[PDB]
């Protein structure tokens, strides 16, 4: 077989494993991860969670600020359902596109329902005598995430 | 992972010296990676205000 510069593609050839072997390996890996979860050998867990239109990377005993008011009183506990990603020192669960509520539970306590610092929005136009000044005060909510829980229900 | 604040900061913002052979190499392609390394665009901790910069020695 002739060998030229353009005879072969300029990238290494990729070989994929057989589907049955891949399924067996995935089953073994998920079983090992489930055994780790059941034994509780995980120290700390972080989670990427979608809330209030934003995605937040949150660990235990953390603080987050939400730019919109929530219909909850201060000191109330709230369970965050939209979990995008869970991770720990040795393992990591990726949702497609979300994790299970029974699989992962995250709880946060409302601390402060306050108002943000005044934001100035001023529009000015050249030599047309157009000035428009507004002061915006945006209600904000502070959430303290206390614990991140994971259940061994993973097949 | 469990480092003190000063050594962790030093490790995070440590400077690195890279080597680059220039024999039979195009100046533009050499300068592309040289500029990337000098600006620190190869570091996820890069920032314009930060002084993240790595030394490059081209022979």
């Amino acid at each position: 077989v002739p060998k030229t510069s353009l005879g072969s593609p300029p990238w290494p050839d990729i070989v994929l494993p057989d589907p049955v072997e891949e399924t067996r390996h995935h089953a073994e890996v998920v079983g090992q991860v489930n055994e780790l979860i059941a034994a509780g050998r995980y120290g700390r867990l972080f989670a990427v969670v979608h809330f209030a239109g934003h995605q937040w990377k949150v660990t235990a005993e953390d603080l987050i600020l939400i730019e919109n008011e929530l219909d909850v009183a201060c000191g109330e506990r709230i369970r965050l359902e939209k979990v995008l990603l869970v991770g720990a020192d040795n393992f990591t669960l990726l949702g497609k596109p979300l994790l299970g509520k029974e699989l992962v539970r995250v709880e946060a306590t409302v601390i402060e329902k306050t108002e943000s610092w005044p934001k100035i929005n001023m529009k000015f136009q050249k030599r047309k005598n157009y000035q428009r000044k507004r002061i915006t005060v945006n209600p904000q909510t502070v959430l303290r995430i206390n614990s991140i829980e994971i259940a061994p229900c993973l097949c | 992972s469990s480092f003190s604040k000063a050594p962790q900061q030093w490790a995070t913002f440590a400077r690195v010296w890279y080597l680059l052979d220039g024999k039979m190499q195009p100046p533009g392609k050499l300068a592309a990676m040289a500029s990337v390394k000098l600006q620190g665009l190869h570091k996820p901790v890069y920032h314009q205000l930060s002084d993240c910069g790595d030394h490059v020695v081209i022979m």
């Binding site: 120290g43 700390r44 235990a60 005993e61 020192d89 206390n146 614990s147 | 992972s1 469990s2 480092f3 003190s4 050594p7 962790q8 030093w10 490790a11 440590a14 400077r15 690195v16 010296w17």
Partner: protein, 97 residues
């Protein structure tokens, strides 16, 4: 104590001595300090990484400006790992039993 470090309030003086005493208690012979990685030696701001090997097994690693500081940091990391006070430990449980 949230976000704090054990040594920030313990203030020990000889991390290497404390580590070797703890290893003797745990039936470990001796830690060996080996230079794993470094960045510049003649520069004004050298960076060194020193790891601790027991029976040629890495137990901890530490960065530093100088080799001695890197070794001390590696000893501190090994001591924290042995005592369980690590950044990846279980967060304190705040619940109602």
């Amino acid at each position: 104590m949230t976000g704090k470090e054990l040594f920030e309030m313990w203030t020990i003086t000889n991390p290497m001595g404390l580590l070797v005493e703890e290893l003797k208690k745990r039936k470990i012979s001796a830690p060996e300090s080996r230079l794993t990685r470094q960045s510049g030696s003649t520069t004004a701001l050298p960076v060194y990484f020193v790891g601790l090997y027991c029976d040629r097994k890495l137990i901890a690693e530490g960065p530093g400006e100088t080799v001695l500081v890197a070794e001390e940091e590696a000893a501190r990391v090994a001591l924290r790992k042995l005592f369980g006070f690590t950044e990846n430990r279980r967060p304190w449980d705040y619940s109602k039993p």
